[PDB]
Structure formats: C-alpha cells, structure tokens
C-alpha cells in the first residue's frame, strides 16, 4: 500500500480588497486532516481531526503561523499577478496552490509536487528533479526568473524530501486503522429495459476506500471502453465512495457482456455478470 | 505539515 500527502490552498480576491478569503486543506491519500480558513471565527474549529490533536499545542501554533505567513504572501502574489495580465481592482480572481509528496510501500519519496494556478489555468510547476520550473504562459516566465534568482527550488526540494516524507510516515503510524485501511466495494449488477431492442446494464460499487477504482465493461472478453457511460467517483458522508458504469446492450445479448472491478481493497479482481 | 510559502509570485 503506497501513500501520499497533498495540500490544497486557495487565495481569493474580492472587488473591495484583493485578499478577504484564504483556504488551506490537508489530505492524506483521500481523508482530510487539516482545514485553515480566514473567514472562520476565530478560529473555533481548530483543532479539527481526532489523530491530529494528539500532537502538542506547539504543532498547531506552528501550522497557524505557516497559514498566516502564506496568506500575507498570497496577498502580494494576487497584486503581482494582476500587473502581469494588466487586470483591474474591480476584478475578483483566484490563485491556487497544490503541494505534496508521493511515497511507496516502504516510505521513500517517488514524486515531489509544488504546482500553482491562476484563475483555473496552470501557472508554474516544480519539475520531478526538484531544481527546475515549468512556466505555462508568458507571465509565468517572469515568475520563473524571479524564483530561480531567489533560489526557491532549493528550499522547496528540502521541504518535500525532508519535512513532507518525515510527517507523512508519522501521520501513518498515529492512525493506521484510519489511513492504512482499504475497504472493498459492495458490488452488484442491475438491468434496465428502456427499449424493446435495447437494454442497459449498470455495474455498481459502494462503500469503498480509497476512491481510486477501475470499472470496465466488456463483451466476448474484448474491452468496450467506447460505449461505456462511466460516471465520476462520488463521495459519501462517511469516508466512503460510490461509482457506477453503464453500457448499451442489444436485447438477448445480455450474457455476452461482463464487468471487471479493480481495487486495492479487493483480494482478487471481480468478474461480475447479470444473474437474474 | 504545512509548507512555508514566503516567496510571492
């Protein structure tokens, strides 16, 4: 079982002041552990997760200091980005940051992430080597030269290779029962008539963790990954996920179609069929 | 743990 930590931060400009809203969300694989909000009073929902409050007040005060530092840095970033695209104070914009680490079964780093985005589009991204950057536009080039002179990559590599890996392995040990767990899906196939000549076969998956699963419909053992109506992995209000896959079938040819289910929480991949 | 982001864009 491989593991990964990822932080999702947003900076929101307003037409009154290009700062008001700042959100920082921490995730281990698919479960949330930390949430920082500027609009939250004062903040009361701090600490948040149960296995995070085991750490002393020195842990929380540090992460509150990090957020406060980041919010003032984001305010400066929101001003600088406006000048690059020649935007006005009347406009409300969104800056997004996505940083984290990827570890294997042992606990060693594989991929280091530090990605940025302005108004939904990719801005600047840290390369796999952790020494070079990737600019996604003309204005992103001027941030790259600003950052390579400031040697930002050196410190970013140091956080990902060190602090990130160190904390993720500690986070795993503190609550193995809540993170290392792998729940299998409650699978069943349903039939829908719709037409006299056509019919719909839907493959279901419920109460699984993590969200990362594979559902594929196939007739005569050959993959039908074209006529498949695959719906996005939707979550449930109890740390579980749901996902379904449908396929258009001619009448009488129901038994030709078979579905394959692949998940970490499964011992052997399921090969479902329409039974009644 | 939260990463210290001190360098503005």
């Amino acid at each position, epitope marked *: 079982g491989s593991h990964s930590m990822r932080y999702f931060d947003t900076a929101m400009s307003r037409p009154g002041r290009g700062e008001p809203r700042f959100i920082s969300v921490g995730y281990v694989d698919d479960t949330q552990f930390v949430r920082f909000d500027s609009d939250a009073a004062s903040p009361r929902e701090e600490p948040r997760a149960p296995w995070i409050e085991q750490e002393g007040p020195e842990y929380w005060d540090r992460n509150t200091q990090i957020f*406060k530092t980041n*919010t003032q840095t984001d305010r400066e970033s929101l001003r600088n980005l406006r000048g690059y695209y020649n935007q006005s104070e009347a406009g409300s914009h969104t800056l997004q940051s996505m940083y984290g680490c990827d570890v294997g079964p042992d606990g060693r780093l594989l991929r280091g992430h530090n990605q940025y985005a302005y108004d939904g589009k990719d801005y600047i991204a840290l390369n796999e080597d952790l020494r070079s950057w990737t600019a996604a536009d003309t204005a992103a080039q001027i941030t790259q030269r600003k950052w390579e002179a400031a040697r930002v990559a050196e410190q970013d590599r140091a956080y990902l290779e060190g602090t990130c890996v160190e904390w993720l392995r500690r986070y795993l040990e503190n609550g193995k029962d809540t993170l290392e767990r792998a729940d299998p899906p409650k699978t069943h196939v349903t039939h829908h008539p719709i037409s006299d000549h056509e019919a719909t076969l839907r493959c279901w998956a419920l109460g699984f963790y993590p969200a990362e699963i594979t559902l594929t419909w196939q007739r005569d053992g050959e993959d039908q990954t074209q006529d498949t109506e695959l719906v996005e992995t939707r979550p449930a209000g109890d740390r579980t996920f749901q996902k379904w896959a449908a396929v258009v079938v001619p009448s009488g040819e129901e038994q030709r179609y078979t579905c394959h289910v692949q998940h970490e929480g499964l011992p052997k991949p399921l090969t479902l069929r329409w039974e009644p | *743990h*939260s990463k210290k982001k001190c360098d503005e864009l």
Partner: T-cell receptor
Amino acid sequence: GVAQSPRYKIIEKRQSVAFWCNPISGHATLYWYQQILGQGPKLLIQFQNNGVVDDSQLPKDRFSAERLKGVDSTLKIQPAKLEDSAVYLCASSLRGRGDQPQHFGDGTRLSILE
Amino acid sequence: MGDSVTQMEGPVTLSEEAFLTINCTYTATGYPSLFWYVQYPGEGLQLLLKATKADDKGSNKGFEATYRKETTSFHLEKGSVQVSDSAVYFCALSDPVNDMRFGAGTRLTVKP
C-alpha cells in the same frame, strides 16, 4: 543595515515607552526580540509584511507592536514594570525562510527606574 | 518540528594563538540550516558563518563549523585564536517549517 531608535532610554515604573525600527530595504519579515541583560534573544512578536505571524510570547497586558504599512515597526510598552529592563533587539529577514539568516539592529537599552 | 539547540556551558577562557572549539548540538527533523552569530561588547548580533545544505563548509575570518547530518553537531573551530575574538557567540537552528532558535550563548575571553 537594520536601524533602531533610540539607542538608550530612561523611563520610570508604570510609564509608557515606544521603540522604533526600520529593516533592510525589501525585507518582508520583521522580528521583535528581548535580550535580558546577560543572556540570549527571546522572540516577542513576528511580522510578515503588514500582518502578525506570531504573538504567543508577547504579553498582551503591557506589550503591543504595529507594522501598519509593512515597512517600519513600532514596539510599545504600556504601564512598564521593573523586569522589562533589558536590551530590545530587532531583526529582519528577506522572506524568512529557514535558509535565510536574520539581520539584527543595534538594539535599544531600556532602564526602568524607581 | 523538533526543535532545540544546546550551546557549550560557562565562559571559555583561552590564550592567544590557541585552538578554539565551541560545542553545539541540535534536534531537528529533516534538512535544517545552521548558523553562528557573534556579539562584540556594546554592538548587537551579527552573522559569523552559515551552512544550509548537508555537508556545507561555512567559514569566515579564521572560523570554521561544518554541518554533519550523521552526528547532528555544529562546532565552532579556529586554529589561531585572537584577542579581538573575545565576544559572546550564539548558535542558531532553523528548518523549512521552523523559525530561527538560539542557543544560551558561550562567552569567549582570549588572554594575550
């Protein structure tokens, strides 16, 4: 270099005192320290631009600090006590940033008299 | 996290041209940056030398302190100590997530 004013100040018990500081041009982060006459520096309040990052060590009852326009800062002591007699240091960092060192001022020697 | 720095106890008294060694040990998780600060009588604190990356040298005006990840130490050394070196020295510790922390301070007194 980091500028601090005054260099020395004489104040009586329960009287108010103000300490001014200006960092190195461009330095986004500022730090206010207390160095008790014969020991190491202890952090009071830390700023990143105009906003406060840490103030857990700052005793709110007497102490206060402002960096309203993200450049120069003003550390103020309300009804001062005899234990506050120390050298008030002030440092700054470019972005700070663990790899970046802090640059200290010449400090302000405060003597609280009966 | 960590995060503590311990500096050598009491005042160090030496003779001029003698070898100097000021001990410093730290507890930090990850890759921290290490510093030495010097406070000459009257004046405030001033950076002496720094070592950020693992196995970084870091040296100024005869002083030396190598960052050794394996032993977790940052000892200040000088071959020929001078009378002008009589001051209070401070070791500093900071990592990517932790702000700079200072040691108690070792006072050096060089006799001619």
